[PDB]
Design a protein around this ligand. Structure first.
Ligand SMILES: CCCCCCCCCCCCCCCCCC(=O)OC[C@H](CO[C@@H]1O[C@H](CO[C@H]2O[C@H](CO)[C@H](O)[C@H](O)[C@H]2O)[C@H](O)[C@H](O)[C@H]1O)OC(=O)CCCCCCCCCCCCCCCCC
Ligand SMILES: CCCCCCCCCCCCCCCCCC(=O)OC[C@H](CO[C@@H]1O[C@H](CO[C@H]2O[C@H](CO)[C@H](O)[C@H](O)[C@H]2O)[C@H](O)[C@H](O)[C@H]1O)OC(=O)CCCCCCCCCCCCCCCCC
Ligand code: CLA
Ligand code: CLA
Ligand code: CLA
Ligand code: CLA
Ligand code: CLA
Ligand SMILES: CCCCCCCCCCCCCCCCCC(=O)OC[C@H](CO[C@@H]1O[C@H](CO)[C@H](O)[C@H](O)[C@H]1O)OC(=O)CCCCCCCCCCCCCCCCC
Ligand SMILES: CC1=C(/C=C/C(C)=C/C=C/C(C)=C/C=C/C=C(C)/C=C/C=C(C)/C=C/C2=C(C)CCCC2(C)C)C(C)(C)CCC1
Ligand SMILES: CC1=C(/C=C/C(C)=C/C=CC(/C)=C/C=C/C=C(C)/C=C/C=C(C)/C=C/C2=C(C)CCCC2(C)C)C(C)(C)CCC1
Ligand SMILES: CC1=C(/C=C/C(C)=C/C=CC(/C)=C/C=C/C=C(C)/C=C/C=C(C)/C=C/C2=C(C)CCCC2(C)C)C(C)(C)CCC1
Ligand SMILES: [Cl-]
Ligand SMILES: [Cl-]
Ligand SMILES: [Fe+2]
Ligand code: NA
Lengths: 348, 36, 31, 336, 76, 37, 449, 35, 44
């Protein structure tokens, strides 16, 4: 490199064989990404098929006990296991693979392999962008799935009592995680979650509205009723009228884009910043640092037996969730609550 | 080398796939996890 | 054979057909 | 010939030279939307407490009654009215019009007409500008969702008191009560909808990053990269084929969009069709078709029920259910 | 170059796969038909989620002797 | 249940509803067979 | 058929290739009508194969057998099924008819003439011949008018129709003297669709139903003759679009309207959709639960006129906002329900206390209890009850299924109307393919947007 | 109170009639394109 | 009665018209808009 001799070494040979264009690009990140990602996805497919959640949660959570696609999950370890890494060789499994599946070790397997697979995938984006000589804005846009995954699947259970409170990899298990955050953390009320929701909704809006605008401002290049064949990707001319689009959205909405680079950076910026602020909120909830209560309104409702709002209704709904969910969701607490102390409404 | 049609291959594969999901939706009502 | 394409296809295809067989088998396991 | 009074008014209305296009759908969209905006602002500021439940207890809902921006909400019409049309002129006075939930039903009717004519006005401006006309179709998905939550769910449930309250914590209340009653989380249409917003965000990040990653060098390091684009230029401002090559060797060489019009069609159609499916999910659950019910599906050889994740979801649902309408039930079944 | 239009249209492809794909499928068939999945991954059979000693869902409630606690809460 | 004459024809009654879905799938089969021209 | 090169339409828009091919278009339509008749017959035979007589029809997942039974086939007093043979007859007749229609569609699609104007000028049309298009429209209005008069004849002279308002609990009735008053008939049409009025969903007697059918059959026949003998006026020419896609978009808007109104009919109406066949309506189930618990708490020695609820507003009886006596609880929202087991108990002041006390009937109370246990709340696994219930009742109401699916179809067809109205307008305008790139209208306008 | 209903009926009828006759006033001819 | 209402809820009135002045003003407004639309014709 740089008018220097640079005698060919084993590193440069392996780099030449790895950074080549083929069916699937391996690179150096493929030394990490392909095994970690393959093991994480295969472990989830194995756990949703054969691995039970009977000894960690007292639930049936695989296709072998009769569960469908939505209810099977790779479930978190027992809360008594805390934040143990659940090695197959460690103090708990002690080398026995079968007892390692039953102990909740497959969740730790899938979580660690998935996290390092996410690292490998971002590094893969980095090396492909460097090889093609393109900017790594795809990696920067992928930084938000990694922030969300780390904050929810590692930072949050690390802040809580153990991996048991991490989300279990499944459909209904994720729904359970969401409902638990509603009942216990009041995660809707948190402004960081609100910024995340606004980011996702605005990004879906941006996706739909950008696609529709581009395809309803297309130039002709036609002689045929199908427009997809009016595009030939080796051309130095735009396909759609940015001027027509700007005029249309200016007179419909009041404001409209006039810079494509700013438009596409905005399409990057809205969901990424939304997921980053949502991840910051989940990190706040990891410590039970919550946006649960409005003290002034709550004092006002306490001192006025006639003042209810949808906020106080949500607080009562949350308490109902907690008391009716705790006994079967947190079995380590042995909550043998009698049915007379469970809070309910009338009749029903 | 291009003897069997790709469309015939794909149609057979799609039949096998729809048969698999149909067996899956059939056995949601019998056997394990059927609630009877 | 044994190309990178063959490895990448097979690492998913072989366990896919194996687990599909398992799910079809235990799909007829009755209570 | 352009002399007549209807000619002057008509060419003013269809004029593309106005700062905001009005048009024939605009002659309805503008007055309905200003009506809904005026009533919504005045009600959010100082609406007296509204009896949502029909049981002689009101929910305050307005800032002047001690609510902050997160809590404040235009509270739906009373349960006693049901789907009955309740205009101001039908009520005895403005005060009891307010107490029975008049501002909500007014704002929701005007918002329906406003979004429908906003869609028509979108089509109209595209027609007047020589455009293709399907931005109205793409906008029909948030309109579908708005109708589903403000009118279609009240028609299915029998009262505007089940509509979404016009507020933040009121919206959260609507979501929690709705999941309690219908299990939206386990409804496939809501699964498609969630996949729609997650995909809309995913492909929004993907499209933005691939275009920003391929912008052709035109400016210096000390200037905004946006300054490399001038409005009205005809050159392609990014390397589409290079972004294709990057995307192909990143995911799949052959399963990558080699057509920019194909990419933008997927961008337009994916969240739009998914929001169509989730709006129809809300409509299906208006007529009580509900989500997937897997409560006590899995049983052992003895017939003893094994709890599952869907059963923990159900326990959370019972918690949500036994708190919505804490005093409005006289009967055990929630058939209302 | 084998662009998937030649492989998926090749009788050579379909003669070395008409045995391997059904072979793996029937291998998966017998893997859970003969209970090897139950042996390997430790998922319980329908008659063995509960013993006489305990009539409730298991609780590991331990960390360092959790191996023998799963050994005693499982089905022997 | 079908009338006493048509009782053994109940199995071929039982498959007849799905035929229009088979028709749209057949349109796609034909388009695949003509190479999606 | 054609390809992308010869037409400009891709395979996923292939039917557009046959917009201007009259014979192939006719073949596609006839084959499609064969599919609709085929589904009607095949599903009718499937239902009568899976029908069970000791259960009511709303418990077996039936959507066509209730439709046949409302015409007065195989059912007698009480809505009880007496013969599945008329249903069998309808199913097999439709299946044979679909064979004939399918042959016609396949023939005209495959080897029929490509365009009909060069050989059969009577059926030959182009989308701009407004005279010919109104002739076709007129023929179809006479056809639909004969369908409506066929129903009128069925109600008048061919066994009548099932009347759920007949005394005793519903029975097939010969309709005599249907209402012909235009005020009564079109008051339904110009009625508000809100609560208590419900537009034309609140039609509540077969007298109004059959009279409106007499009315609509005569208008359809008259308008058909008018359309055969006229051409659209210049205002109609200046306002409408005259492409086949435009006619399609008009039809799409109209049938989306029909789908939405069909959803509301199935959900609310109980005289064209009797509850004996379709299950109770939404209001019917809640009012039924209130009514049952009212009579049980009369049998357990308690006064229901008194005994206010936990909010002090009344456990069993209360006042509607308009002043009458209604059932207490959340079912007050359904206070405008009207059914065959509440009207004999309703006085001028709403529910009458002495009539509720003494003039009860056993058939009304068992109908109410059965409607209470079979409310239109279920999951899409067909798991009856609210989302918090157990997998123990395999039941979802046909009213739920019909209203659900037809709202979905009505909405998607409104969206299709949007798509086609836009594409027809832009195709008549000339920029259905995009902007000219040299004569772009936006560059010719003033600055500042 | 009836007065407000009369005035609102006038408003809605006026705007709906404006919409109706605005679209009746040769709207498909207000395209910018050729023909 | 403790107050006065238009008590027009329900009863299915044509276009919600409870006094004929509403129908006459609907007729008048549509009629005068049709009148201006008709006198301003033979244009474009
Ligand atoms: C002006 C038009 C306004 C339309 C929207 C306002 C809401 C209308 C409504 O309250 O809807 C409900 C009404 C039915 O009204 C009900 O009508 C019922 C009539 O049944 C009565 O009479 C029956 C006779 O057997 C029975 O006895 C029954 O038990 C008894 O209650 C009752 O009166 C109810 O109180 C009453 O609410 O539907 C109808 O009138 C049919 C109207 C068409 C259905 C439209 C559905 C979709 C609407 C908008 C979608 C927009 C799409 C575009 C954007 C996206
Ligand atoms: C990408 C590529 C393209 C993609 C295409 C995707 C298209 C479709 C994908 C979905 C596949 C469907 C799943 C098939 C399994 C199934 O269906 O299985 C269901 C049944 C078969 O199972 C039977 O289902 C029955 C359903 O109960 C019915 O019968 C019961 C009798 O006890 C009760 O009477 C009950 O009330 C009644 O509902 C019973 O449970 C039987 O025991 C059981 O064997 O198939 C049936 O019905 C047939 C299906 C008919 C319903 C569809 C038309 C009606 C549409 C309504 C829209 C409503 C809502 C939309 C969503 C929300
Ligand atoms: C992309 C490669 C990769 C990566 C990054 C990981 C990463 C991880 N794996 Mg893993 N794994 C992989 C591939 C990979 N794996 C493959 C291919 C297999 C199949 C065999 C497995 C099977 C596997 C199992 C069964 C388990 C893991 C587990 C783990 C986690 C903890 C492992 C650990 O702590 O030991 C780390 C190991 C090292 C750091 C190796 C260091 C070697 C040094 C550099 C050499 C020095 C040794 C030398 C001989 C010392 C002698 C001294 C003498 C010379 C003087 C971790 C996140 C555990 C887990 O999932 O937890 C739940 C677990 O039980 N993996
Ligand atoms: C209701 C569904 C329907 C119907 C009635 C039609 C009808 C038609 N299509 Mg079409 N199509 C459909 C759906 C449908 N399509 C869908 C969903 C797609 C998207 C995949 C397409 C995409 C498409 C394209 C791209 C094209 C058509 C074309 C055509 C026309 C001629 C076909 C032809 O002759 O080529 C030959 C077809 C065959 C030789 C297949 C024969 C199979 C037969 C018809 C099936 C019926 C057999 C039946 C079981 C036996 C009953 C007989 C008796 C016992 C009753 C025809 C009128 C072509 C056209 O526009 O014409 C100019 C054309 O280019 N279609
Ligand atoms: C739209 C009208 C309609 C309605 C209201 C019904 C209603 C009903 N049907 Mg029926 N059916 C219909 C049309 C209809 N059907 C058609 C067109 C067919 C031919 C395929 C059938 C064939 C049929 C059979 C064979 C049976 C029924 C049965 C039933 C009953 C139970 C339904 C059930 O639980 O299934 C489950 C519900 C679903 C499967 C809903 C699916 C959701 C949608 C449709 C699919 C998802 C779309 C996807 C997300 C979007 C992709 C877009 C694009 C990529 C394609 C119920 C009353 C059963 C019965 O009770 O018999 C008496 C029964 O055995 N139906
Ligand atoms: C569904 C069948 C059908 C269809 C598709 C058409 C279609 C058409 N008719 Mg027609 N007509 C029909 C049935 C039908 N008609 C019947 C059954 C009759 C007998 C009563 C007539 C009598 C008739 C006459 C006298 C005329 C037409 C005319 C026309 C043409 C222009 C109409 C127009 O401007 O649109 C829409 C019309 C309007 C927007 C203004 C109409 C005023 C309202 C909408 C009528 C309904 C009143 C009601 C209170 C409105 C609210 C109803 C709502 C709440 C449901 C058009 C092609 C005209 C023509 O061009 O002559 C050739 C014309 O002169 N028709
Ligand atoms: C009587 C109604 C009707 C008729 C005659 C037409 C006719 C036509 N349409 Mg159209 N359309 C309609 C309704 C109708 N449409 C509706 C309701 C929608 C929904 C918004 C659309 C959306 C639409 C689009 C986007 C396009 C057309 C196009 C076309 C033209 C070519 C169609 C073709 O070959 O596509 C091929 C057929 C297929 C690809 C098969 C479609 C497969 C669908 C998606 C599966 C749906 C099944 C699923 C179970 C539905 C469940 C939904 C829910 C209820 C559960 C043709 C003239 C094209 C066009 O404009 O050409 C000029 C085109 O671009 N249509
Ligand atoms: C798009 C999708 C369309 C899908 C479905 C369409 C839904 C419904 C179709 C119409 C059903 C109802 C028709 C009758 C309307 C009616 O009589 O209103 C009459 C009602 C009656 O009004 C009320 O009546 C009550 C008694 O029922 C009392 O008398 C009240 O005092 C009175 O306010 O007024 C309205 O509800 C609003 C009328 C004005 C509506 C303006 C919007 C129209 C927009 C465009 C029209 C363009 C042409
Ligand atoms: C054009 C075309 C097409 C087609 C379409 C269609 C639609 C067709 C059709 C057709 C049809 C629509 C047909 C039908 C038929 C029918 C038949 C063939 C029948 C029959 C009969 C029988 C044999 C029966 C019997 C019975 C009885 C009588 C009773 C008892 C039971 C039983 C079943 C035994 C497609 C899309 C593909 C593609 C494109 C082209
Ligand atoms: C999606 C797609 C595809 C496809 C797939 C598939 C797989 C399909 C299918 C399909 C199918 C699967 C079809 C079938 C068919 C059939 C038909 C259509 C028929 C018929 C017939 C009839 C009509 C009947 C009749 C009768 C009666 C009526 C009675 C008795 C007698 C008899 C039986 C005769 C592919 C991948 C390629 C490509 C891409 C796209
Ligand atoms: C059977 C029956 C009945 C009867 C019924 C009836 C008689 C009906 C009718 C009705 C009618 C009689 C209707 C009418 C209508 C109309 C419509 C629905 C329309 C439309 C359209 C449109 C939307 C338009 C648009 C436009 C304008 C604005 C102007 C011109 C141009 C254009 C196109 C732009 C009753 C219920 C009694 C009972 C039950 C059964
Ligand atoms: Cl609540
Ligand atoms: Cl209640
Ligand atoms: Fe772009
Ligand atoms: Na309660």
């Amino acid at each position: 490199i740089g008018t220097y001799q640079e005698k060919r070494t084993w590193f440069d040979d392996a780099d030449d064989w790895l950074r080549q264009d083929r069916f699937v690009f391996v690179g150096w990140s493929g030394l990490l990404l392909l095994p970690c990602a393959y093991f994480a996805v295969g472990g989830w497919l194995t756990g949703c098929t054969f691995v039970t959640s009977w000894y960690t949660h007292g639930l049936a959570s695989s296709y072998i006990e009769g569960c469908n696609f939505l209810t099977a999950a790779v479930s978190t370890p027992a809360n008594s296991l805390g934040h143990s890494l659940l090695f197959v060789w460690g103090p708990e499994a002690q080398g026995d693979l079968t007892r390692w599946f039953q102990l909740g070790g497959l969740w730790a397997f899938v979580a660690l392999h998935g996290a390092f697979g996410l690292i490998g995938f971002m590094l893969r984006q980095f090396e492909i962008a460097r090889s093609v000589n393109l900017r790594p804005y795809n990696a920067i846009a992928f930084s938000a799935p990694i922030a969300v995954f780390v904050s929810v699947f590692l930072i949050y259970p690390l802040g809580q009592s153990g991996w048991f409170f991490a989300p279990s990899f499944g459909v209904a298990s994720i729904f359970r995680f969401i409902l638990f955050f509603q009942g216990f953390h009041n995660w809707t009320l948190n402004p960081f979650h609100m910024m995340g929701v606004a980011g996702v909704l605005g990004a879906a809006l941006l996706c739909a509205i950008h696609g529709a605008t581009v395809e309803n401002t297309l130039f002709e290049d036609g002689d045929g009723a199908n427009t997809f064949r009016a595009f030939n990707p080796t051309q130095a001319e735009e396909t759609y009228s940015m001027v027509t689009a700007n005029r249309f959205w200016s007179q419909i909405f009041g404001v409209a884009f006039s810079n494509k680079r700013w438009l596409h950076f905005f399409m990057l910026f809205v969901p990424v910043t939304g997921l980053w602020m949502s991840a910051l909120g989940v990190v706040g909830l990891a410590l039970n640092l919550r946006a649960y209560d409005f003290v002034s309104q709550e004092i006002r409702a306490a001192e006025d037996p006639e003042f209810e709002t949808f906020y106080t209704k949500n607080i009562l709904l949350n308490e109902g969730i907690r008391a009716w969910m705790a006994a079967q969701d947190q079995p380590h607490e042995k909550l043998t609550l009698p049915e007379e102390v469970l809070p309910r409404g009338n009749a029903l | 080398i291009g003897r069997i049609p790709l469309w015939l291959v794909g149609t057979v594969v799609g039949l096998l796939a729809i048969g698999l999901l149909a067996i899956f939706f059939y056995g949601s009502y019998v056997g394990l996890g059927s609630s009877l | 054979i044994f190309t990178v394409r063959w490895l990448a296809i097979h690492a998913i295809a072989v366990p896919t057909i194996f687990f599909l067989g398992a799910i079809t088998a235990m799909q007829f396991i009755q209570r | 010939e352009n002399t007549s009074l209807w000619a002057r008014f008509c060419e003013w209305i269809t004029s593309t030279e106005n700062r905001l296009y009005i048009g024939w759908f605009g002659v309805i969209m503008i007055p309905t939307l200003l009506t809904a905006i005026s009533v919504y602002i005045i009600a959010f500021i100082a609406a007296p407490p509204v009896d949502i439940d029909g049981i002689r207890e009101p929910v305050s809902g307005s800032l002047l009654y001690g609510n902050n921006i997160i809590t404040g909400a235009v509270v739906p019409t009373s349960n006693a009215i049901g789907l009955h049309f309740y205009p101001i002129w039908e009520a005895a006075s403005l005060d009891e019009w307010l107490y029975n939930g008049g501002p909500y039903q007014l704002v929701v009717c005007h918002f329906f007409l406003g979004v429908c004519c906003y869609m028509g006005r979108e089509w109209e401006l595209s027609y007047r500008l020589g455009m293709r006309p399907w931005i109205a179709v793409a906008y029909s998905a948030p309109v579908a969702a708005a109708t589903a939550v403000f009118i279609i769910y009240p028609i299915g449930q029998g009262s505007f008191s089940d509509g979404m309250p016009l507020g933040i914590s009121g919206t959260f209340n609507f979501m929690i009560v709705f999941q309690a009653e219908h299990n939206i989380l386990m409804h496939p249409f809501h699964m498609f909808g969630v996949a729609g917003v997650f995909g809309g965000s995913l492909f929004s990040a993907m499209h933005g990053s691939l275009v920003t990653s391929s912008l052709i060098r035109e400016t210096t390091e000390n200037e905004s990269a946006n300054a490399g684009y001038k409005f009205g230029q005809e050159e392609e401002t990014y390397n589409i084929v290079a972004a294709h090559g990057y995307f192909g060797r990143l995911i799949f060489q052959y399963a990558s969009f080699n057509n920019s019009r194909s990419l933008h069609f997927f961008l337009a159609v994916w969240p739009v069709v998914c929001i169509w499916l989730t709006a129809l999910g809300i409509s299906t659950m208006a007529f009580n078709l509900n989500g997937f019910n897997f409560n006590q599906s899995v049983v052992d050889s003895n017939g003893r029920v094994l709890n599952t994740w869907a059963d923990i979801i159900n326990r959370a649902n019972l918690g949500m259910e036994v708190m919505h309408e804490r005093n409005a039930h006289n009967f055990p079944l929630d058939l209302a | 170059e084998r662009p998937f239009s030649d492989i998926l249209t090749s009788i050579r492809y379909w003669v070395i796969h008409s045995i391997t794909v059904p072979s793996l499928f029937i291998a998966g068939w017998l893997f859970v038909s003969t209970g090897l999945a139950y042996d390997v991954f430790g998922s319980p059979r329908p008659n063995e989620y509960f013993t006489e000693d305990r009539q409730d869902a298991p609780l590991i409630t331990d960390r360092f002797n959790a191996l023998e606690q799963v050994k005693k809460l499982s089905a022997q | 249940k079908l009338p006493e004459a048509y009782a053994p024809f109940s199995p071929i009654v039982d498959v007849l509803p799905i035929i229009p879905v088979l028709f749209i799938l057949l349109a796609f089969v034909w388009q695949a067979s003509v190479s999606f021209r | 058929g054609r390809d992308q090169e010869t037409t400009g339409f891709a395979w996923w828009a292939g039917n557009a290739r046959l917009i201007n091919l009259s014979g192939k278009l006719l073949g596609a339509h006839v084959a499609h009508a064969g599919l609709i008749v085929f589904w009607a017959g095949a599903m009718n035979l499937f239902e009568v194969s899976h029908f069970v007589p000791e259960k009511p029809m709303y418990e077996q997942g039936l959507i066509l057998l209730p439709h046949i039974a409302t015409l007065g086939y195989g059912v007698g007093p009480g809505g009880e099924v007496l013969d599945t043979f008329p249903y069998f007859v309808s199913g097999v007749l439709h299946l044979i008819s679909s064979a004939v229609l399918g042959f016609g569609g396949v023939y005209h699609s495959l080897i029929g003439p490509e365009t009909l104007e060069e050989s059969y000028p009577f059926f030959g049309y182009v989308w701009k011949d407004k005279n010919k298009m109104t002739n076709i429209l007129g023929y179809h209005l006479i056809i639909l008018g004969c369908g409506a008069w066929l129903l009128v004849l069925k109600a008048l002279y061919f066994g009548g129709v099932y009347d759920t308002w007949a005394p005793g609990g519903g029975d097939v009735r010969i309709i005599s003297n249907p209402t012909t008053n235009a005020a009564i008939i079109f008051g339904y049409i110009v009625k508000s669709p809100f609560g208590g009025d419900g537009w034309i969903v609140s039609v509540d007697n077969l007298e109004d139903i059959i009279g409106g059918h007499i009315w609509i059959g005569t208008l359809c026949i008259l308008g058909g003759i008018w359309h055969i003998y006229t051409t659209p006026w210049p205002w109609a020419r200046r306002a409408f679009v005259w492409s086949g896609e435009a006619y399609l978009s008009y039809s799409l808007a109209a049938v989306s309207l029909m789908g939405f109104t069909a959803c509301c009919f199935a959900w609310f109406n109980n005289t064209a959709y009797p509850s004996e066949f379709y299950g109770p309506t939404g209001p019917e189930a809640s009012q039924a639960q209130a009514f049952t618990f009212l009579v049980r708490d009369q049998r357990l020695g308690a006064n229901v006129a008194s005994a206010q609820g936990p909010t002090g507003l009344g456990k069993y009886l209360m006042r509607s906002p308009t002043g009458e006596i209604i059932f207490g609880g959340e079912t007050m929202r359904f206070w405008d329900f009207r059914g065959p087991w509440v009207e004999p108990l309703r006085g001028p002041s709403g529910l009458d206390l002495v009539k509720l006390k003494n003039d009860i009937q056993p058939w009304q109370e068992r109908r109410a209890a059965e409607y209470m246990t079979h409310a239109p709340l279920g999951s899409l696994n067909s798991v009856g009850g609210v989302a918090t219930e157990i997998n123990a009742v395999n039941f979802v109401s046909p009213r739920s299924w019909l209203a659900t699916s037809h709202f979905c179809l009505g909405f998607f067809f409104f969206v299709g109307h949007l798509w086609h109205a836009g594409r027809a307008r832009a195709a008549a305008a000339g920029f259905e393919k995009g902007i000219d790139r040299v004569d772009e209208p936006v560059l010719s306008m003033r600055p500042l947007d | 109170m009836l007065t407000l209903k009369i005035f609102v009926y006038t408003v809605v009828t006026f705007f709906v009639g404006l919409f109706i006759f605005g679209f009746l006033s040769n709207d498909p001819s207000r395209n910018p394109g050729k023909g | 009665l403790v107050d006065d209402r238009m008590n027009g809820d329900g009863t299915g009135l044509p276009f919600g018209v409870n006094d004929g002045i509403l129908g006459w003003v609907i007729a008048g407004t549509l009629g005068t808009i049709w009148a201006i639309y008709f006198v301003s014709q033979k244009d474009l």
